[PDB]
Amino acid sequence: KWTSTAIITQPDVGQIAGYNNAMNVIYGQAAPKVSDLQETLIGRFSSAFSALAETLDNQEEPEKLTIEPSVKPLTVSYVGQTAEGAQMKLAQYIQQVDDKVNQELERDLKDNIALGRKNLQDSLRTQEVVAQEQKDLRIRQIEEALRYADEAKITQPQIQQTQDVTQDTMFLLGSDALKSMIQNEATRPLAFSPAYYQTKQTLLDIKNLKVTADTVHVYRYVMKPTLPVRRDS
Amino acid sequence: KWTSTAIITQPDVGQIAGYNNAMNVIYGQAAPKVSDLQETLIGRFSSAFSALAETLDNQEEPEKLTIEPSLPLTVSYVGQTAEGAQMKLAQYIQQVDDKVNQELERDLKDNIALGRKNLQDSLRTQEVVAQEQKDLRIRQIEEALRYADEAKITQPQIQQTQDVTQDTMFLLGSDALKSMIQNEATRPLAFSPAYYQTKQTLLDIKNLKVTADTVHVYRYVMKPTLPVRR
Amino acid sequence: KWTSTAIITQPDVGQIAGYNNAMNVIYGQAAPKVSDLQETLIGRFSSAFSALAETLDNQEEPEKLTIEPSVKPLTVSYVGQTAEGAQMKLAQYIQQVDDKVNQELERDLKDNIALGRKNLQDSLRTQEVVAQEQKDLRIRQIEEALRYADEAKITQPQIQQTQDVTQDTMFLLGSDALKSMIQNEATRPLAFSPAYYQTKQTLLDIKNLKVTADTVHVYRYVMKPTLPVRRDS
Amino acid sequence: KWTSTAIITQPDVGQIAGYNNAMNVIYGQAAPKVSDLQETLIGRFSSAFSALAETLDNQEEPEKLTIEPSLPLTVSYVGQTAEGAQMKLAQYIQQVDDKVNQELERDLKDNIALGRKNLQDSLRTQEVVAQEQKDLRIRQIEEALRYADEAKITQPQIQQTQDVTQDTMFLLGSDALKSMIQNEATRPLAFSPAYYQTKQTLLDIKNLKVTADTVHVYRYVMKPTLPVRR
Amino acid sequence: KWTSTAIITQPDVGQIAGYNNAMNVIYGQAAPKVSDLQETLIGRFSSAFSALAETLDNQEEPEKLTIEPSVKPLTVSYVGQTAEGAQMKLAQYIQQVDDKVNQELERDLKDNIALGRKNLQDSLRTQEVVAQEQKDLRIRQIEEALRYADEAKITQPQIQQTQDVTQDTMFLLGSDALKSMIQNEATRPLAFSPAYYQTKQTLLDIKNLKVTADTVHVYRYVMKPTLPVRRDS
Amino acid sequence: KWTSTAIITQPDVGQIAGYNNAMNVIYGQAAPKVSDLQETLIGRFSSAFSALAETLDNQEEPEKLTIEPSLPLTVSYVGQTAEGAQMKLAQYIQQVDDKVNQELERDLKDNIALGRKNLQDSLRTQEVVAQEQKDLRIRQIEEALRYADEAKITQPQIQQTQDVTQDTMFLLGSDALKSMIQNEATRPLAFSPAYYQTKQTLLDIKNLKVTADTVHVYRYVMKPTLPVRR
Amino acid sequence: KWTSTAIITQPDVGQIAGYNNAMNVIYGQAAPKVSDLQETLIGRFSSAFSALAETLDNQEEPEKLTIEPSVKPLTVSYVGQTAEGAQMKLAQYIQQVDDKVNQELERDLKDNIALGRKNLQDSLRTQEVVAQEQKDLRIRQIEEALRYADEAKITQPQIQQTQDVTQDTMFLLGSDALKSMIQNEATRPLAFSPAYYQTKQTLLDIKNLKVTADTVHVYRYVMKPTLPVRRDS
Amino acid sequence: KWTSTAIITQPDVGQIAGYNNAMNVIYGQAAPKVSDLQETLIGRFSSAFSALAETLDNQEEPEKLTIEPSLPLTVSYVGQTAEGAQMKLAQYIQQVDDKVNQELERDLKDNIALGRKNLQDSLRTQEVVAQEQKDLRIRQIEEALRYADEAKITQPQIQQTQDVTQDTMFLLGSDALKSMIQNEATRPLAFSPAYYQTKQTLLDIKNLKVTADTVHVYRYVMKPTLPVRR
């Protein structure tokens, strides 16, 4: 016989900064726009709140919880047996839904992070396979260059600057160096690209993420549950 | 007549991360956006659920299963007991879920198999092109040998290289040029970044493992209810 | 007096991967988006199915086949004289239409491939005409450079690195080499661009395409033709 | 009164590949997308067919030909016999098809002829610009000769070139610079990639061959029916 | 009492190629899309035809000319006193409007070309003023470099390659050359950019344009004026 | 009561080429598209014409002037004679045309004057920045002189230059570095392409000449009629 | 009993050039499009005019001022006791609103400029902190290079061109120079980027802005306040 | 019953410049456009004002506060005296203004604090990557030392450098290479532009100062009126 009401809306951008940051680490340029996250989050609360209303109606002693767009933020209400009771229950049910959806979001985020980590680790591995193939081919090129240097009887380097060399100019390094590059192939480091190090960077960032109760929020109060001064009618 | 209801919606992004990753490996920049994937997946469950509903009508004793926008979707089932309505709704949801998941998994494995084949063929044809380029390079070296012989340059005439062109190859000297020609068969091909990107994508597609965890097509907002009143 | 029904929708992306790949080889960046292909394909089945329904009505003994959007996938139906008969005929007519449209698609794809091949072959030819003109001009430049080298009495090369040369610096290669480059012009390879080799690559890919019954599909079952348990009414 | 009907739709992409290729040669990046071409072509058949219908009304004995959305389009013809309705519908479709194809073919040949002329003119004017650039280069060489004479540099003073500038041309030496000037008339023009792209497009436009296979404007979903009942 | 009708639509792309080309020379990347030109052109005919209809109604003896979208191409009509007369007049009035609008288009195009030519000529002039300022500044730099070379007593060049020089390295060319570059400044050619030569190219193309009766068209017949077989009613 | 009508529409592109060119000089990439300019201009005539109509209502003897879509526009005037209706309509169109043209011309001249001022100020501030950069370069040269003195390098130690850096300036030698410092006052500023683009735009804006031919705001599809009937 | 009317619309682009320029200096690529400024400005006048109408109605002796779209430009009106009075008051009230909104705009612009100046000044400061860190690191690199040069006993430079040096090739400058670069680190200028000088450029432009009564306008007359020839009715 | 009204609209761009600057520091290219910020801010005031209206209804003696489009917005309050209506409307506007401003300020400070933390963590992880790159460089130097020893190159063999590669590092000579290895611990890390951009953003975020002037959420078009009539 007494109705408490509250008005809620999307969480503020500062309050979801943690979640936004995590999404940007995971998805990069494909991460959702913050305004879209805001809509998604309040939407999730809204549908969960509506479901709770159904649960509360499906009782031997039904309870009346409502939610609907304020215009035509969201206006929510609860009908209680007393003014204090209605207010208290509305606050309780808002918190109940909040706790439920936050837990789901946190768990899904941790799942996402774990998968992203595994995928980045796998990507480093396969990128290393490719880099190893490239190194192996370079050693082959050096082996061929040694043939050419041996034919020209070039044992010492003929170039007077540090510079790129290709299959056709490698012989100019001279057979002394070329032989050493071949003999020591096993300890020659791989040539890793900026893209490879971007993968490592992302993996480090993903592993640094910590999902907590502060990471995301799904609503804010425009008006907290009211203590109705008059009974319904 | 007891009615059970449930409320379902699109799967969460974490729950389709495997599928999303696979689509990105297979399609690259043309892979669907995550939000679009979500809509597609719940849509697929939804049409399958409507189809089951109906199938269930086409029985000696027809059953009433429904689905409609409640954002999410509300599904309902009319049973002859409270527990029966709840249990059968849950079972029918799982039945549709299992069916759609199997179809998606098999289609994805098919897609991966074809992608692998296509990438392998691509490496083969790219190698044909790389071979033609090597063959032409050897011809350029053969011509540069003529020029070096005419200038009587047997040893390299350089102090650095800025990169090697048809017109300056002769400066490498006939001793080296002759050796490059003699040993052409053991000269490695010059592969491009695009070739290695093809190899990279092939390694990644072969690394995909499609399991029951790879994709999902719905999540519960509210599980099937046990109706308190008929 | 007995109605069988089925529900069908667009083919899955994995089931049209072959067709999609072929389209990407043929059209490159202009190839249709896979979702658009899906719509096109089911659309083609749909219109062919509707045409069949007209054909079946235009009979001394009319038959009733229907198709329409399920909502407010596509729902199709057939009205038969018995439950088993209706189901069997609906399945038959779906397969009949499927076979017809698949054949059209396959034949059009093979036509497209043949034309693409011819066009790529022609493009290689014309690109070679251009490359030949560029080589011919370079030989002319070398002829002029020989004049300059002869005037400066430069017979041996004056540069100490491999590098690009232009009309004004070609003379620095010296008249011995320049004369040889001119004398041997016929055996000087053409200078082919990355774009030229992209054309060759595409031609190789186009020739590797094989159109089969697995290449494309135009529908999938959401629900296979039903065996109706009750007569109409 | 017997009615025959047919169902037609846009031509297939394979069947307009020739026309599409030609449009791409002529217009490049501004060529219409294939799907747009398809819509344009069936649209052209459609308006021509309506026009024939309406013509056929304007007769001492009016005939009824129609076209409407069936998504595809449904066309119909009312004849005085079953075979007549079918035969005349097929003939009228072919009549319109022949008319539209001839118009498209002639317009495309006109477009190709003008494009050829435009490309040829473009090569001419580009050559005028290339000539002005060569003339200026010779003037730069004439000035560099002055500087080389003042420094008394007759032979080249370099070991490589990095890029050749007005200010460092003199390092090539007066012997070579004088020869470059003396022989200016036989110095080839320096043509750019854009010039060769113009030549490339000209070769390709000249390679186009417009035939009855080049374009199509419809395909049958269902050929004209033989009506079983009046 | 007799109505002749015709159906017309936008001119074909091949028939407006001349106009399209001229517009592309004048406006470059800002030239209208050919489909937009097509719409503009038929639109111009349409409004002129409607105006003629008003002119023909405003007569001591009114005549009835009509135009309207065929569906909800354009359908036009004329009502004459005889079948042959109606057809002949409709054809006449279509040609009359065609001639009028073509003349306007041709004259506006020639006006546009003349203005474009003047603007390009002016642009070459101002670009040359800028290039002259750049040359003047370079001569100043060379004057300063001569000071530095004189202080270091560098009379001969100290660099062994052709290369770019800047204010700080110009002195390495040596005072003999630097003095000559200064003494001969008047005959030093300006350094013109690719953008400058693009302006010259466009000017040459603009001057090559020739506007004729074939340059543009504004309609094509879908159906030529009919000879009505029956009077109205 | 005699009514005269005319049909008018947006000015042609050739007839607003001057105005379009000016807008492009002043605004560059932010200049309005031609088609948008056309719409803007006829729109301006239209509102001015409506205003004249409201003016003409607010008279001891009200006059009726109208404008409406024929999209083109149809304008009309109700006169007391046939010739009067025609003549007054033509005069009122010209009256509005003259008024709008004068406003556009004056506004454009204002815009040009401000643009000139802004470009001149921009050259001044850009020069301040260029001066700061020169001053810093001289400081770098002063430091390089210290390093050259410590290494006792008085003459240049190079054979080419690849860029000149703070750390390799000393290789130019103290004789030259000292001279660069001593003569800093006569060292020209190093101006960028952007600086010269500002100069270019200034020359072009100063070249604009606004005349009665620069812009137009309508064209006649049909001139005011002489009505044959009242 | 007498109504004066006027018609007004958005200010012309030339009349708001000053404001537009200021906005472009402040916001760069994010500055509003001029057409959007035009709409904003007339909109501001419009709402202020409507507010004035409310103020004038809220009087012991109400006055009737109106504004509304001409179709569903803006048409404004005032109802006075005489023809001359109505016209005079309408003109007065238009000017009154004009003065009010112009003052607000000017003050907000000056506020914006002051803040932009402060922000640019702060940005130069922080950019200098970064440049100083980069210089400090370079001095560290030079310190390490001195170690290497000392080990190789390289006191004089070994390179024969001006060029970039890195950590690994700095030693080639020789210990005499390297020691001097270290000893004189305090007087080594910072290495400022083009982005840094763009910040300085913008600051200079911002400081050159002068907001006056000519800077912006918010309306223009299509028709000035009329002197009504007849009373209302 | 006396009604006071006011007309309010979005805050001006100058009045939210602080907030806009902060958003740009924190979000960069993803920062909201100014016009969008304006709409967001007045929207926030508006919903808070509606909420106050309810609050004021839920009283033993209900009060009537309203807000609606006039765009701008018109707000009104019904009081029991003319001065009371005006005064209470002004107070309620200020009350809502104070509440929303405090929320925005606290949220912005929270956002800044998290951004600072995130940037600091980013510098740490970027440094881990830079360290791995340095460690690999030292390994390359260790290998180049082997090659130099084999060629017996102890002193540098170069006249310039074009960058330094694994394959040409040996030309620096074993004396220098050994020293580079011996002194690896004091070799500075090689930081990228992106690293310094992170440092730059951190300095700027730390420079932000959130005050009552940072943001505003409305401006008055018309202040609360003193109604002359009941």
From Swiss-Prot, chains B, D, F, H:
Domain of life: Bacteria
Subcellular location as annotated: Cell inner membrane
Function (record text): Confers a modal distribution of chain length on the O-antigen component of lipopolysaccharide (LPS). Gives rise to a reduced number of short chain molecules and increases in numbers of longer molecules.
Family per record: Belongs to the WzzB/Cld/Rol family.
Protein name (Swiss-Prot/TrEMBL): Chain length determinant protein
UniProt source species: Shigella flexneri
Gene name for this UniProt entry: wzzB
Parent-record interval covered: 55 to 200 of 325
